[PDB]
Design a protein around this ligand. Structure first.
Ligand code: CLA
Ligand code: CLA
Ligand code: CLA
Ligand SMILES: CCCCCCCCCCCCCCCCCC(=O)OC[C@H](CO[C@@H]1O[C@H](CO)[C@H](O)[C@H](O)[C@H]1O)OC(=O)CCCCCCCCCCCCCCCCC
Ligand SMILES: CCCCCCCCCCCCCCCCCC(=O)OC[C@H](CO[C@@H]1O[C@H](CO)[C@H](O)[C@H](O)[C@H]1O)OC(=O)CCCCCCCCCCCCCCCCC
Ligand SMILES: CCCCCCCCCCCCCCCCCC(=O)OC[C@H](CO[C@@H]1O[C@H](CO)[C@H](O)[C@H](O)[C@H]1O)OC(=O)CCCCCCCCCCCCCCCCC
Ligand SMILES: CCCCCCCCCCCCCCCCCC(=O)OC[C@H](CO[C@@H]1O[C@H](CO)[C@H](O)[C@H](O)[C@H]1O)OC(=O)CCCCCCCCCCCCCCCCC
Ligand SMILES: CCCCCCCCCCCCCCCCCC(=O)OC[C@H](CO[C@@H]1O[C@H](CO)[C@H](O)[C@H](O)[C@H]1O)OC(=O)CCCCCCCCCCCCCCCCC
Ligand SMILES: CCCCCCCCCCCCCCCC(=O)OC[C@H](COP(=O)(O)OC[C@@H](O)CO)OC(=O)CCCCCCCCCCCCCCC
Ligand SMILES: CCCCCCCCCCCCCCCC(=O)OC[C@H](COP(=O)(O)OC[C@@H](O)CO)OC(=O)CCCCCCCCCCCCCCC
Ligand SMILES: CC1=C(/C=C/C(C)=C/C=C/C(C)=C/C=C/C=C(C)/C=C/C=C(C)/C=C/C2=C(C)CCCC2(C)C)C(C)(C)CCC1
Ligand SMILES: [Fe+2]
Lengths: 342, 108, 81, 37, 504, 37, 37, 34, 38, 188
C-alpha cells in the first residue's frame, strides 16, 4: 500500500553487493559514460583534426601517449553537444571535432556529484558522520577548477587538460612555461598538503605497526586482531613517548591525529584549487618585479629565480608553434631564444 | 561473540586450510610450542582475545566459505551431453574465428 | 561479515557451467573486437585517419579547424580522401 | 522563426525527459516486481 | 570549552541575537561601502575620462555607482567630463555619506536588538520556546525581494521614476546613463542587450511577489519538511550559501565575458576583445571607409578617436596582470598621455609589414613582421650571427599616421626595433612613468580583480554548502555515533540498509 | 542447508557492464598490434 | 653467433634466460596449489 | 554495409549456447521472485 | 551430470598466464607496426 | 565510410626508403620522410622549403631566380658563383660591433663559412651542376656548426638552387644520410 517513493526507496537502498541508492541514478549512468568515453576516445578517436596529433591506440599511441584531446580553439567554450550547431548529429564528425572531451568532462563532472551524494546517502543510512563526503570536496574542487574553471577563463576548451597521461604532462609543462605555476604560493600550499599527507600516511601506518600489542604467539601479527575487539591494538602511550623523544612533539589524542590526517590533504588541494582559479584569468604569480628591476639595471645580479624566468621563455617559444596551432606561429629559428651551443 | 561453526568453513577438505581460514592453531596454543626462529610461545593461540570474542578477524569475516556455495554448482546439469555439444561447438567456432581473422587481414 | 544474497564468486568461477558458457562468450567478444578493427570498421565509425590518410595531395600539413558554426563542413573537407 | 539549433535544443530537452522517464519506469517496475515484505 | 571555530554558534537558537549579529555584518558592509567610496574619491582623477578612465585608476566601487546612475560629484565634476549641474544629494560623495550614516544606524539597532533579545515575538505560542517559522518567514522576505526586484526594473532601470542605467555603444566610445525600455521578445535574453535587464527585473519581480504569496499561504509538505529539516535554521544557511555561490559564479562569468551590466567604459575591456580583434577590426574598418572617400592615410588615421585606439592596447587587457602586481593599471605601465598614431612598417621595396600582435598567453613574445599573406619577412633575431630576417638587412622603416608622431618616419634600426616592440602590444601610446614611478609590468583592471575575488569566494562557498549542508542533515550524530551500531551495519543482516524491519 | 541463488542480479549487470566492453576492447587493441604502416 | 654445429638449437637459447624469473612464478603457483597453507 | 552485420552474427551462436545452459535455472529464478 | 569443480588455483594460473600473454603482445606491438618509430 | 580494411598482418611498409619523391616546376628531388613543409621564405625566389620535424636547423630550400643566362658557367667559375651567393649562409648585419674574444674567428667577426668541397658535376642529360659543401660556424657554437650542401644549375634562363643545411650535432648522429640523399636527388 506504500506510495511510489517508498516502494522505489526500498529497492534503491536495498543492501546488495553494490549499493545503488538514489544517488546511483545519477552516478552510475554518468560514471559509466565518462569511463566509456575515455576508453573509447583513447582507443579509436583521433586528435588529428583538433590538435594535429595522434592520440589513440588505433593510430599507434600507447597507454602513455593516448588521450581524449580537447576541441580546437576555434570552438571556444562550446559545450559541443552531439546535436549542437557544431557536428549537428553526425557522430563520427562529433568525435573528430573533439566533442568526446566535453562528453567526458561533463558526464564526468556529474559523476563526481553523484559519488559525493553517494557518500552522503550511505553515511545517513549507516548512521555515521559525513566526513568522507567532506573529504571528497577537495578532489572535486581540483577537478572543477582545473577542468572547468581554468579553460572557461582562457580562450576555450583547447587549453583545458586533455584526458591522458602525456596530455596531462603537457598541461603541467605548459603551466610552468606560461604561468610559472611552481612559483605560485597556492601550488606551494598544495604541495605541502600532498607531501605532508603522504608523510602522515607513512608515519602513522608505520607507528601503528611498530607499537602493536602482543595479542598472539605467531610472528604474523596480522592475524592477532578482531574488528569487534574493545581493547586498542597498539600502544598510543609508547607511540607518544617514541615520537616525543625522537621528534620533540607527538600526538597524544587519537581523535586529533585522524582529523589532522584528513585536514592536511583536503586543505592542500583546496588551496591549490584557488591558485588555478587565479591562473584562469592569467592572474599569476609569475615574477618578482623588484628583482626584475634590479636584474635589468644590474647585469651582474643573478638568482635562481631569474634563471627560471629564462627557462620559461625557452618553454614558451619552442612550444607555442605546435602546442598552439591556431595561432599559426611561424617562428624562424633565428628568433627563438637559444643559449650558447646546445 | 562469534560462532565458528556458523561461519561457513565447516566443509573444508584440508584440516590445515580449515584451521587457517578459522584463524585457529592447536599447535600454537601449547606452551611448549617453538617458533621456526626458536622463540617459544606465551600460551596464546593465533589470537589471545579469542574465546572472549569467539574468533579472530580470520574467522570473523571469511572470504572463502564453501558452505554457502550452491549445491547445483557442484556438477554440470547437462552432463556428458552438454560437454560433447560444448566440445563440438568449440571446434566449429574456432574454425570460423580463425577463418574470419585470416580473411579480414592483409595476410597473403 | 555475512553476505548480501548474491552467489559467491568463488562458487561461480569454480563451477563447470560458468566455464562452459564463458569458454565461448569471452572468446567471441575478443574476436568481435578483432574484427571491428581488421575490417576497417573502427576507422569508419570514429573517423580516425588510416595510416595513409593523414595527408592528401591538397593538404600536406596538419589540419586546422578555423570555424565554429561551419566546423561540420570544414572537418569534412579536411577529412576528404 | 525556429532555427535548426533551437529545434535540437527542444529535441534534447524531450530526449532528456525520455531518458529520465525510461530510468524512472525501469526502477518503478523492478521495485514493484521485487518488493520487500 | 567551546572550540574557537564554533564561537558564533551561540546565536544559532537565539532569534533576537541572530538579528543583532546579522545587523552588525550589515553595518560593516555598508560601512565598508561608504569608506571605500570616500577613499576612491580622494584618489580618483576625473580630468581625463578618455585616456585615464576609472578602470585604469583601480577604482572598484566607483564603476558600480556609475553603472546605476551616479555621475556627478559635489566637487562640480561629472564622470563624462562635462560640468556638474546642481548635483543634489545623490552624488558620489552623497552616496558615500549615505552608506556611512546607514552603517551607524544599523550599528545602533544591532545594540538594541542584542540587549533586548527576549522578545515575545521570537517565542513559539504553543511551547513558549524560542523558534522561527522559517517557511512563513521565507514567504515574507521573498515577497519583499520580489517587490524590490520589480520596482528596480520598473521605476529605476526603466526610467519611469529613476535615472536608468549606464548604456554604452558597442565600442565603448559614447556611453551615458539612459532609461532603457524592457525588451520582451527573445532579444531580452541576449546578455549584451540592456533592455533585457529591465524586462528581467520586472518579470522576476512579478513572479517573486506571487511566489512570496504562495510561500506565505501554503504550508510545506510533511515529507518535504522532514527531508529538508525545515525546522532547523542551519538548513536555510546551507541553501542560502548554495544560492549565493551559484550567483557568484554567474556574476563572475558575466564580468569576465562582458554583458550589458558590465560596460567596458566602466570596468575596462575584456580579454576576449583583444583575442578576437574586436577593436582592431573596427579601427581598420573606419580607416578603410575613410580611404574609400579618397582621404589620405595620414588624415584617415587622424579621424580615429583616441578612446577607440586606447582599447586596442594589450595593456588594457585584463588577462595580462599578476596576482601580486598590486595597484592601478596606471601604476604598471604609466599614465597614458597621448596616442602616437598608427605605425605602418614598410619593407625597403615598399611592401607593408605587420607586426604579429602578442597573444594574451605570452609574458614575452618574439617580434616578427608579416606581410599581407602572412609570410614572415623581417624580425628582431635572437641569434645575430647568421640572420636572414634582421630589419637591418631588410631595410624596415616605420611611419606614423595620426596621433602625435603623424608624418614622422624612422629608418634607423634601433628606433624601428623600439617601435616594433611597441607595435606587438597593439596601438602605441605615450605613457608617463614618472608621477607614480611605474614599474613597467601590466596590471589587471577592476574586471579582472572582481572576477578573481568572486570566483575564489564562489569556490570557497561551495565547501560552505557541503559543510553547513552536512551539519543540518547529520545533526543527530554531530557529537559522535551511537555506541551499539554493529548489528545494523552488518552486511546482509537486513534487506534494506538501515531499516531494522527488513531482516533477512 | 541448501542455498539457491539468482543468476541475474544488479551485481551481474555491473560485472558485465565493465567486463563485456573490456574484452571487446582488448580484442580490438590486440588486433591493432599487427597493423603495419 | 653460435658455432655452425649448434645453429639448429639457436631458438632454444633465445628463450633460456627467462627461465629464472619463471621460478618466482613457479613458487607462487605452487603455493596456490596448496591453498597458501 | 555488412561489416557490422558479420560481427553481430557472432552473437547468434553465443546467445543460443548461453540459453542452452542458463534458460532452465533462469526460469527457476523468475518463478521464485514472481 | 558430470560432477566436479575447476580448482580455483588452476583458474588463477590460466587467467594469470592469459594476462601475462596479453601484456606481452602489447609490448611486442610496441616494437613493430604502428607506434614503433620504424 | 571509406570501407577499406586495416593492414593487419601486412608484412610490408609502404615507404621505408626514408625519402618521399617530390616533383616541382622543372625540378625534382627526394625529400626526407620525416621533414615537414614550411611556409618560411628565407630568400628571394623560394619555391619549396621543408624542415625537419625534430630540429628546425635541418631544412632544405629550393630557389628559382631569373638569372637570364643558359649555363651555370655563364654565372662565373664555381668559386666566383659561391662568393656571389654568400647571402645564402646568412649575414651578421645585425651585429655591427667590434670584438676580439671570439675564439677561432677573425677579428670583429662572429661567423665564418668554411668551404670543404667545390665540385662541378654534370647531369646524365648534360646540365652542369655546381655542387658545394660548406660548414658554417658561429661564435654561439650552435649545433656545433651547420653543414650546407648547395647544388645549382641554370635552365630556361632560371637559376635552380637547392640548399640543404644540417646541424653538425644531427649530421654525425645520422641526419647526414637524409641531407646528402636529398642534395644528390636534386635534378632540373
Ligand atoms: C542521469 C544520467 C545523465 C545525465 C545527468 C546526463 C547529463 C548530460 N549529458 Mg548524457 N547521456 C545519458 C545520461 C545522462 N546524461 C545516457 C544514458 C546516454 C545514452 C548513452 C547519454 C548520452 C549523451 C550524449 C550523446 C550527450 C549527452 C550530453 C549530456 C550533457 C548535456 C546534455 C543535456 O543535458 O542537455 C539537455 C538538458 C535537459 C534534458 C534538462 C532536463 C530537464 C527535464 C528532463 C525537463 C523535462 C522535459 C519535459 C518534456 C518537460 C517539458 C518542458 C517544456 C518547457 C519543454 C549533460 C551534462 C551531451 C554532451 O555530452 O555534451 C558534450 C551529449 O552529446 N548525453
Ligand atoms: C536604501 C538602501 C540602499 C541603497 C539605495 C543602496 C545603493 C547602492 N549601494 Mg548599498 N548597501 C545597503 C543599502 C543600500 N544601498 C546596505 C543595507 C548595505 C549593507 C549590506 C549595503 C552595502 C553596499 C556595498 C558593499 C556596496 C553598495 C553599493 C551601492 C551602490 C551600487 C549598488 C549596485 O550597483 O550593486 C548591485 C546590487 C545587486 C547586484 C543586488 C543583486 C541582488 C541579488 C542577485 C539577489 C538575488 C537573489 C534573490 C533573493 C532572488 C529571489 C527574488 C526573486 C525571485 C524576485 C548604490 C548606489 C556598492 C558601491 O558602489 O559602493 C559604494 C557596494 O559595493 N552597498
Ligand atoms: C571582492 C573584493 C575586492 C575587490 C575585487 C577589490 C579590488 C581592488 N581593490 Mg580593494 N579592498 C577590498 C576589497 C576588494 N578590492 C576590501 C575589503 C578592502 C578593505 C581592506 C579594500 C581596500 C582597498 C584599498 C586601500 C585599495 C584597494 C585597491 C583595489 C584595486 C587594486 C586591486 C589590488 O591591487 O589588490 C591586490 C591584491 C593582492 C596584492 C593580493 C590579493 C590577496 C591574496 C590573493 C590573498 C592571500 C592571503 C593573504 C594575502 C596572506 C597574507 C600574508 C601576509 C604576509 C600579508 C582593485 C580593483 C587599491 C586601488 O587600486 O586603489 C584605487 C587600493 O589602494 N582596495
Ligand atoms: C539529464 C539528461 C539526461 C539525458 C541526456 C541526453 C540523452 C540522450 C541524448 C541523445 C538523444 C538525442 C538528443 C538530440 C535530439 C535531437 O533533436 O536531434 C538532433 C539531431 C537532429 O538531426 C540532425 O539535425 C541537424 C540540424 O537540423 C541536421 O539537420 C542534421 O542533418 C540532422 O542529422 O540528431 C541527433 O543529434 C541525434 C543523434 C542521436 C545519437 C544517439 C547516440 C549515438 C551513440 C552511438 C552511435 C555509435 C555509432 C553510430 C555511427 C556509426
Ligand atoms: C527599503 C529600501 C529600499 C531600497 C530601494 C528603494 C529606492 C532607493 C533609492 C530611492 C531614492 O534614491 O530616492 C531619491 C528620490 C529623489 O531624490 C532626489 O534625487 C535627485 C536626483 O537628481 C537629487 O539628487 C536630489 O538631491 C534628491 O533629493 O527620492 C524619491 O522621490 C524616492 C521616493 C520614494 C521612496 C519610497 C519608496 C521606495
Ligand atoms: C524534481 C522533484 C524534486 C523533488 C525534491 C524533493 C524530493 C524529496 C525530498 C525528501 C525525501 C524524503 O522523503 O526523505 C528522505 C528519504 C526518505 O526518508 C524516509 O525513509 C523511510 C525509510 O527509512 C521511508 O521511505 C519514508 O517514506 C521516507 O520519508 O531518505 C532517503 O531515502 C535516503 C536517501 C534520500 C535521497 C533523496 C531522495 C529523493 C530523490 C529524488 C526524489 C524524486 C521524486 C520524489 C517525488
Ligand atoms: C582584518 C583585520 C586584520 C588585517 C590584517 C592584515 C592582513 C593583510 C592581508 C593582506 C592584505 C593586503 C593585500 C596586499 C595589499 C597590497 O598588495 O598592497 C596594497 C594594495 C594597493 O596597492 C597600491 O595601490 C595604490 C593605489 O591606491 C597604488 O596603485 C600603488 O602602486 C599600489 O601598490 O591594496 C590592495 O589593493 C589590496 C586590497 C584588497 C584586494 C583584495 C582582492 C582579492 C579579494 C578577495 C580574494 C578572495 C579570496 C582569496 C583566497 C582566499
Ligand atoms: C542479392 C544478391 C546477393 C545476396 C546474397 C545473400 C547471401 C550471401 C551468400 C554469400 C556469402 O557468403 O555472403 C555474402 C554476404 C556476407 O556478409 C553478410 O553480412 C550480413 C549482414 O547482415 C550478415 O552478417 C551475414 O551473416 C554475412 O554473411 O552475405 C550477404 O548477405 C551480403 C550481401 C550483400 C549484397 C550482395 C549483392 C549486392
Ligand atoms: C632531536 C631533533 C629534533 C628534530 C626537529 C623536530 C622539529 C619539531 C617541530 C614541531 C614544531 C611544530 C609544533 C606543532 C604544534 C604542536 O606542538 O602541537 C602539538 C601536537 C600535540 O597534539 P595533541 O595530540 O596533544 O592534541 C590534543 C588536542 O588538544 C589537539 O588540539 O603535536 C602534533 O600535533 C603532532 C604534529 C607535529 C608535526 C609538526 C609539523 C612540522 C613542523 C613544521 C615546522 C615548519 C618549518 C619551520 C622552518 C622555519
Ligand atoms: C561507485 C561505486 C563503485 C562500485 C564498485 C564497482 C562495481 C563493479 C564491481 C563488481 C565486481 C567486483 C569484482 C571484485 C569483487 C570480488 O570478486 O571479490 C570476491 C572475493 C570474496 O567474494 P566471494 O564471492 O568469495 O564471497 C563469498 C562470501 O560468502 C565469503 O566472504 O573478494 C576477495 O577476493 C577478498 C578481497 C579481494 C579484494 C579484491 C577484489 C577482487 C578479488 C580477486 C583479486
Ligand atoms: C555610530 C553612529 C555614527 C557613525 C557611524 C560610522 C563612523 C560608521 C562607519 C563605520 C566604518 C568606517 C566601517 C568600515 C568597515 C571596514 C570593513 C568592514 C573592511 C574589512 C576588510 C576586510 C573584511 C578584508 C579582508 C581581506 C584583506 C585584508 C586581504 C585580501 C582578502 C580580503 C579582501 C578578504 C553616525 C555618525 C552615523 C551617527 C549615528 C551613530
Ligand atoms: Fe589509525
Amino acid at each position: 500500500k506504500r506510495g511510489w517513493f517508498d516502494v522505489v526507496d526500498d529497492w534503491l537502498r536495498r543492501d546488495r553487493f553494490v549499493f545503488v541508492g538514489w544517488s546511483g541514478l545519477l552516478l552510475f549512468p554518468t560514471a559509466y559514460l565518462a569511463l566509456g568515453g575515455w576508453f573509447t576516445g583513447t582507443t579509436f578517436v583521433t586528435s588529428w583534426y583538433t590538435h594535429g596529433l595522434a592520440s589513440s591506440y588505433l593510430e599507434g599511441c600507447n597507454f602513455l601517449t593516448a588521450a581524449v584531446s580537447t576541441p580546437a580553439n576555434s570552438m571556444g567554450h562550446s559545450l559541443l553537444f552531439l546535436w549542437g550547431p557544431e557536428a549537428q548529429g553526425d557522430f563520427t564528425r562529433w568525435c573528430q571535432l573533439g566533442g568526446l572531451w566535453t562528453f567526458v568532462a561533463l558526464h564526468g563532472s556529474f559523476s563526481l556529484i553523484g559519488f559525493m551524494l553517494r557518500q552522503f546517502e550511505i553515511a545517513r543510512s549507516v548512521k555515521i558522520r559525513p566526513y568522507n563526503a567532506i573529504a571528497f570536496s577537495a578532489p572535486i574542487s581540483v577537478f572543477v577548477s582545473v577542468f572547468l574553471i581554468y579553460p572557461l577563463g582562457q580562450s576555450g576548451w583547447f587549453f583545458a587538460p586533455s584526458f591522458g597521461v602525456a596530455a596531462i604532462f603537457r598541461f603541467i609543462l605548459f603551466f610552468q612555461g606560461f604561468h610559472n605555476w611552481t612559483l605560485n604560493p597556492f601550488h606551494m600550499m598544495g604541495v605541502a598538503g600532498v607531501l605532508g599527507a603522504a608523510l602522515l600516511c607513512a608515519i602513522h601506518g608505520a607507528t601503528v605497526e611498530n607499537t602493536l600489542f602482543e595479542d598472539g604467539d605467531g610472528a604474523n601479527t596480522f592475524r592477532a586482531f578482531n574488528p569487534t575487539q574493545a581493547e586498542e591494538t597498539y600502544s598510543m602511550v609508547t607511540a607518544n613517548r617514541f615520537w616525543s623523544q625522537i621528534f620533540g612533539v607527538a600526538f597524544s589524542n587519537k581523535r586529533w591525529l585522524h582529523f589532522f590526517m584528513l585536514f592536511v590533504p583536503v586543505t592542500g588541494l583546496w588551496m591549490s584549487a584557488i591558485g588555478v582559479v587565479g591562473l584562469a584569468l592569467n592572474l599569476r604569480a609569475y615574477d618578482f618585479v623588484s628583482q626584475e628591476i634590479r636584474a635589468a639595471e644590474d647585469p651582474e645580479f643573478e638568482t635562481f629565480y631569474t634563471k627560471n624566468i629564462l627557462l620559461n621563455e625557452g618553454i614558451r617559444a619552442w612550444m607555442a608553434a605546435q602546442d598552439q596551432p591556431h595561432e599559426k606561429l611561424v617562428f624562424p629559428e633565428e628568433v627563438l631564444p637559444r643559449g650558447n651551443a646546445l | 561473540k562469534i560462532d565458528i561453526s556458523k561461519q561457513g568453513l565447516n566443509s573444508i577438505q584440508n584440516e590445515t586450510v580449515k584451521l587457517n581460514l578459522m584463524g585457529k592453531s592447536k599447535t600454537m596454543e601449547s606452551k611448549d610450542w617453538v617458533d621456526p626462529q626458536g622463540r617459544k610461545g606465551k600460551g596464546y593461540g593465533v589470537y589471545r582475545f579469542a574465546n572472549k570474542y569467539g574468533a579472530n578477524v580470520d574467522g570473523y569475516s571469511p572470504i572463502y566459505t564453501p558452505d554457502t556455495w550452491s549445491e547445483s554448482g557442484d556438477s554440470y546439469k547437462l552432463g556428458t551431453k552438454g560437454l560433447i555439444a560444448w566440445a563440438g561447438l568449440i571446434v566449429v567456432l574456432l574454425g570460423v574465428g580463425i577463418n574470419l581473422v585470416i580473411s579480414t587481414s592483409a595476410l597473403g | 561479515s555475512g553476505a548480501t544474497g548474491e552467489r559467491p564468486f568463488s562458487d561461480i568461477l569454480t563451477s563447470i557451467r560458468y566455464w562452459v558458457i564463458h569458454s565461448i562468450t569471452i572468446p567471441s567478444l575478443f574476436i568481435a573486437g578483432w574484427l571491428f578493427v581488421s575490417t576497417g570498421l573502427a576507422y569508419d565509425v570514429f573517423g580516425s585517419p588510416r595510416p595513409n590518410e593523414y595527408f592528401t595531395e591538397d593538404r600536406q600539413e596538419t589540419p586546422l579547424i578555423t570555424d565554429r558554426f561551419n566546423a561540420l563542413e570544414q572537418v569534412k573537407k579536411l577529412s576528404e580522401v | 522563426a525556429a532555427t535548426p539549433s533551437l529545434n535540437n535544443l527542444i529535441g534534447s530537452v524531450v530526449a532528456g525527459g525520455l531518458v529520465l522517464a525510461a530510468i524512472a519506469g525501469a526502477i518503478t517496475a523492478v521495485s514493484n516486481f521485487d518488493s520487500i515484505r | 570549552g567551546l572550540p574557537w571555530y564554533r564561537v558564533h554558534t551561540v546565536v544559532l537558537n537565539d532569534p533576537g541575537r541572530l538579528i543583532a549579529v546579522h545587523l552588525m555584518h550589515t553595518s560593516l558592509v555598508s560601512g565598508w561601502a561608504g569608506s571605500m567610496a570616500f577613499y576612491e574619491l580622494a584618489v580618483f582623477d576625473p580630468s581625463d575620462p578618455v585616456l585615464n578612465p576609472m578602470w585604469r585608476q583601480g577604482m572598484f566601487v566607483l564603476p558600480f555607482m556609475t553603472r546605476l546612475g551616479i555621475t556627478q560629484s559635489w566637487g562640480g565634476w561629472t564622470i563624462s567630463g562635462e560640468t556638474a549641474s546642481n548635483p543634489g544629494i545623490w552624488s558620489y560623495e552623497g552616496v558615500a555619506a549615505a552608506h556611512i550614516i546607514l552603517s551607524g544606524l544599523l550599528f545602533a539597532a544591532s545594540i538594541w536588538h542584542w540587549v533586548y533579545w527576549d522578545l515575545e515575538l521570537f517565542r513559539d505560542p504553543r511551547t513558549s520556546n524560542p523558534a522561527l517559522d522559517l517557511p512563513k518567514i521565507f514567504g515574507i522576505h521573498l515577497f519583499l525581494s520580489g517587490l524590490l526586484c520589480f520596482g528596480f526594473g520598473a521605476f529605476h532601470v526603466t526610467g519611469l521614476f529613476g535615472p536608468g542605467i549606464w548604456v554604452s555603444d558597442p565600442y565603448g566610445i559614447t556611453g551615458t546613463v539612459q532609461a532603457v525600455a524592457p525588451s520582451w521578445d527573445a532579444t531580452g535574453f541576449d546578455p549584451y542587450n540592456p533592455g533585457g535587464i529591465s524586462a528581467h527585473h520586472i518579470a522576476a519581480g512579478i513572479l517573486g511577489v506571487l511566489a512570496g504569496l504562495f510561500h506565505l499561504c501554503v504550508r510545506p509538505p510533511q515529507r518535504l519538511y522532514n527531508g529538508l529539516r525545515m525546522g532547523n535554521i542551519e538548513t536555510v544557511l546551507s541553501s542560502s550559501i548554495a544560492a549565493v555561490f551559484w550567483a557568484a559564479f554567474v556574476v563572475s562569468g558575466t564580468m569576465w565575458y562582458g554583458s550589458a551590466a558590465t560596460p567596458i567604459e566602466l570596468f575596462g575591456p575584456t580579454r576576449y576583445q583583444w583575442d578576437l580583434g574586436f577593436f582592431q577590426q573596427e579601427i581598420e574598418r573606419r580607416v578603410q571607409t575613410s580611404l574609400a572617400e579618397g582621404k589620405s592615410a595620414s588624415q584617415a588615421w587622424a579621424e580615429i578617436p583616441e578612446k577607440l585606439a586606447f582599447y586596442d592596447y594589450i595593456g588594457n587587457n585584463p588577462a595580462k596582470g599578476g596576482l601580486f602586481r598590486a595597484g592601478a593599471m596606471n601604476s604598471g605601465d604609466g599614465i597614458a598621455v597621448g596616442w602616437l598614431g598608427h605605425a605602418v612598417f614598410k619593407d625597403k621595396q615598399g611592401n607593408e609589414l605587420f607586426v604579429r600582435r602578442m597573444p594574451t598567453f605570452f609574458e614575452t613574445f618574439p617580434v616578427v613582421l608579416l606581410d599581407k599573406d602572412g609570410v614572415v619577412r623581417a624580425d628582431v633575431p635572437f641569434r645575430r650571427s647568421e640572420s636572414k630576417y634582421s630589419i637591418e638587412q631588410v631595410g624596415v622603416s616605420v611611419t606614423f599616421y595620426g596621433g602625435e608622431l603623424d608624418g614622422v618616419t624612422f629608418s634607423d634600426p634601433a628606433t624601428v626595433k623600439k617601435y616594433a616592440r611597441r607595435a606587438q602590444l597593439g596601438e602605441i601610446f605615450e605613457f608617463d612613468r614618472a608621477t607614480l614611478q611605474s614599474d613597467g609590468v601590466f596590471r589587471t583592471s577592476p574586471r579582472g580583480w572582481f572576477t578573481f575575488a568572486h570566483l575564489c569566494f564562489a569556490l570557497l562557498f561551495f565547501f560552505g554548502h557541503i559543510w553547513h549542508g552536512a551539519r543540518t542533515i547529520f545533526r543527530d550524530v554531530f557529537a559522535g555515533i551511537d555506541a551499539d551500531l554493529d548489528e545494523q551495519v552488518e552486511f546482509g543482516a537486513f534487506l534494506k540498509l538501515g531499516d531494522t524491519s527488513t531482516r533477512r | 542447508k541448501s542455498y539457491t541463488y539468482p543468476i541475474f542480479t544488479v551485481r551481474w549487470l555491473a560485472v558485465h557492464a565493465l567486463a563485456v566492453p573490456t574484452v571487446f576492447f582488448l580484442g580490438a587493441i590486440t588486433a591493432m598490434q599487427f597493423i603495419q604502416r | 653467433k653460435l658455432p655452425e654445429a649448434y645453429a639448429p638449437f639457436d631458438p632454444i637459447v633465445d628463450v633460456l634466460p627467462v627461465i629464472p624469473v619463471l621460478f618466482l612464478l613457479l613458487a607462487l603457483v605452487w603455493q596456490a596449489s596448496v591453498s597458501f597453507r | 554495409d555488412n561489416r557490422f552485420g558479420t560481427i553481430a552474427l557472432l552473437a547468434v551462436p553465443v546467445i543460443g549456447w548461453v540459453l542452452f545452459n542458463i534458460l532452465g535455472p533462469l526460469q527457476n529464478q523468475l518463478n521464485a521472485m514472481s | 551430470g558430470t560432477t566436479g569443480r575447476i580448482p580455483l588455483w588452476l583458474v588463477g594460473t590460466v587467467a594469470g598466464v592469459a594476462v601475462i600473454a596479453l601484456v606481452g603482445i602489447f609490448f611486442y606491438g610496441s616494437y613493430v607496426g604502428l607506434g614503433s618509430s620504424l | 565510410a571509406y570501407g577499406d580494411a586495416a593492414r593487419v598482418f601486412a608484412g610490408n611498409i609502404t615507404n621505408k626508403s626514408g625519402f618521399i619523391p617530390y616533383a616541382g616546376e622543372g625540378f625534382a628531388l627526394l625529400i626526407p620522410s620525416k621533414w615537414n613543409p614550411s611556409k618560411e621564405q628565407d630568400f628571394p625566389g623560394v619555391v619549396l622549403r621543408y624542415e625537419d620535424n625534430g630540429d628546425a636547423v635541418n631544412n632544405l630550400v629550393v630557389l628559382v631566380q631569373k638569372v637570364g643566362k643558359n649555363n651555370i658557367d655563364e654565372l662565373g667559375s664555381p668559386d666566383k658563383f659561391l662568393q656571389d651567393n654568400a647571402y645564402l649562409f646568412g649575414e651578421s648585419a645585425a651585429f655591427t660591433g667590434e670584438t676580439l674574444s671570439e675564439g677561432g674567428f677573425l677579428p670583429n667577426k662572429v661567423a665564418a663559412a668554411s668551404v670543404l668541397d667545390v665540385q662541378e658535376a654534370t647531369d646524365k642529360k648534360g646540365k652542369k651542376y655546381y655542387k658545394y659543401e660548406v660548414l658554417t660556424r658561429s661564435a654561439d657554437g650552435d649545433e656545433g656548426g651547420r653543414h650546407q650542401l648547395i647544388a645549382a644549375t641554370v635552365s630556361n634562363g632560371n637559376l635552380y638552387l637547392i640548399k640543404v643545411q644540417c646541424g653538425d650535432k644531427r649530421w654525425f648522429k645520422g641526419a647526414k644520410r637524409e641531407a646528402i640523399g636529398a642534395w644528390d636527388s636534386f635534378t632540373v
